[PDB]
Amino acid sequence: PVEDLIRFYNDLQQYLNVVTRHRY
Amino acid sequence: GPSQPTYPG
């Protein structure tokens, strides 16, 4: 699978790019 | 759940 694979990655990528933006 | 869950290996 590839759509469900990257869609699982991207959904948590935000929590690792947008939350880390607050020195996390 | 899915009828054919993917697996490793």
In the block, which residue shows the tokens 């694979």? A5
**What was the elucidation method?**
NMR
Query: What does the angle CA A20 – CA A14 – CA A16 come to, to the nearest 5 degrees?
Result: 35
Give the helix ranges, DSSP H, for A1-24: 3-17
Q: Which two tokens stand for residue A24?
A: 């996390």
CA distance A9 to B1: 20
- Side-chain-side CA neighbours of A22 within 13 Å: the count stands at 5
